[PDB]
């Protein structure tokens, strides 16, 4: 599993589960192409978006809709959504995790990458 | 003034001087244009951007180019650049402060919104 | 003013206010001692700890009561307080400003050491 | 495994490894009694703490000991260590995940509380 997403709740300390995320590539006419999307399990994780035929080096964007999450549990955030924009493979495969950690008005992320 | 954001980096435990960033106003056929932008101060600060006659409601994404930020150090990061990506709402007098902290493989971005 | 505070809340956007800490200073025997105390203005700053004829080298703890915090405001919070731990050290003109942000189940903090 | 930590680096995006770390539980005299102690392993996690037994109600301390962590790597970091003060088991047996992230001058944790 090359690319795969954690994402915590900081308000009820808890992994955050349901949220959706979209993940675009670059294109080369510098456009947005959808890669992947799914939604984080009760374990506030979410795998099997790609494989490492298909994820290719480029510029990837991972959305993390934050707004939908707290929306669906009745608080209204300060945030659209969370975005991770980075350059993938470019020194041969690796495999990213990206961590993020929820709150109404904040958010952090890292990144793992392991070889 | 309606819209500040301040950058620190937290691998010197200093503000991010020299920061470009660009703020964009989301149209109504979903595409991101130009609003204002500018590089953060010796305080890491970046004040004047928009005016309060200017700053209607809407979607606004501040386009942070922490990349060229951590290049210019010596240091290969993660990011291409950072997003903060939020909707301004009419709910009383409002100023809304923008704080990044930058990581080469991480960062925390928190909202302030003040009267 | 050689030691500031700053403390925000990341559930509301706003300035964590009227929030109370101690500062102490390690003695040769491993025990705290106290140093100074506040707490937080409407800004979310405690000014005016500490000169700097007084702010000698040495280990200091802020212990900020975020537990009192949560609990006005009807939540419930994970953490007892939350410590920040650090050297201060002569190396030029140094200013310090100790940031925390605040979740139930979470807090961040960092240090910005300015000239 | 009811007492879990999890530490990531945010300047070399991966797992702290070799992260030592000291618990202790507030005994009855309110001095702070050694619980257990571990280091993080390549995965960046110390498992095997305490047993559901061992860990009854109190208040306890996990000391992270975050400048061995940098200084082992040549880094001079600002905090003597991460503190995570907490009341555990107060409804009840919990499982607890104290999550990390660690920059020199910065860091963050959260807490992940399941039933
Ligand atoms: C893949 S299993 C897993 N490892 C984790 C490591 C950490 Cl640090 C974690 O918390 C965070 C995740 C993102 C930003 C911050 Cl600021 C914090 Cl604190 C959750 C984790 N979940
Ligand atoms: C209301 S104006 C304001 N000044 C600030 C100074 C600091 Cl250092 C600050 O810290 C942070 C900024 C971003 C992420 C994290 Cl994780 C932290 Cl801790 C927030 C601030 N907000």
Redesign the interface.
């Known amino acids: 599993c090359p690319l795969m997403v954690k994402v915590?709740?900081?308000?009820?300390?808890?992994?955050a589960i349901n949220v959706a995320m979209h993940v675009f590539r670059k294109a080369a006419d510098d456009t947005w192409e959808p890669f992947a999307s799914g939604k984080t399990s009760e374990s506030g994780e979410l795998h099997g978006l790609t494989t490492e035929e298909e994820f290719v080096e480029g510029?990837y964007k991972v959305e993390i809709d934050t707004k939908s999450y707290w929306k669906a549990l009745g608080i209204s955030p300060?945030?659209?959504?969370a975005?991770?924009?980075?350059?993938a493979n470019d020194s041969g495969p690796r495999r990213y995790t990206i961590?993020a950690?929820l709150?109404?008005?904040?958010?952090?992320?890292?990144?793992?990458?392991?070889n």
Do not use: K, M, N, Q
């Open positions: 915590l709740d900081a308000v009820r300390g808890s992994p510029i300060f945030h659209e959504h975005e991770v924009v980075f350059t961590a950690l709150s109404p008005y904040s958010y952090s992320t890292t990144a793992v990458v392991t």
